[PDB]
Amino acid sequence: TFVALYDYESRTETDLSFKKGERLQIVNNTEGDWWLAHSLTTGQTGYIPSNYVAPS
Amino acid sequence: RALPPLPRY
Secondary structure (H helix, E strand, C coil): CEEECCCECCCCCCCCCECCCCEEEECCCCCCCEEEEECCCCCCEEEEECCCEEEC | CCCCCCCCC
16 A cells, blocks of 8 residues: 655556555556556556655 | 656755
């Protein structure tokens, strides 16, 4: 259960843009700075940056 | 994939 520390304003149709305070179900990540998360609201996927999130 | 420029600050 990670948390968006920064407002990600993605501009592509792949990564989902989120805001601060929004929770994101992290999926796989432990090598680069880009991880894949899944929002528990609508049920979609969106690669969220690690600099805009952290374990909390 | 240059990471997003953190909010200036």
